[PDB]
Amino acid sequence: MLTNSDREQIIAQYQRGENDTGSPEVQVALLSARINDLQNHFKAHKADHHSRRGLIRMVNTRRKLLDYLKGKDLGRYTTLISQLGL
Template sequence: MAITKEKKQEIIDSFRREEHDTGSPEVQIALLTARINDLTDHFKTHKKDHASRRGLLMLVSKRSSLLKYLRLTNRKSYLEVIGRLGLRK
């Protein structure tokens, strides 16, 4: 259910700005998206897992906040991230 260490490192490597970057908004959005997709698959089989659903909603809210921040500070990077992750339009 959780993201493996290798998968997490792969996501960080593909979205980071520089070599030791692990906390930029782009990386955080990509990691949250991976967790959200994982939880979405989980809910296809566990429809009544409301505790995890609450966690999913918190992750979606956090990602939304990060996307808003990125949109306001670095529009080019925002458009690149949503294009690569397949978010929004």
């Protein structure tokens, strides 16, 4: 999983201000890193169905946040998914 050291590094790169950690950009960035990290766990444990329900949840959460940005600030959205490759 993601450690504290790198988790704070993604926040520091997607900061919308001083130690916010709550903006749609930082949340989507945190979910994106977490989702990609779990791709290694599910490659070795594909029968893990109870953990995968958790993975879908943050995939669903990330989609809801991206929908919110697209409706809120289009420029903030097209730029964010350019960095995250979504």
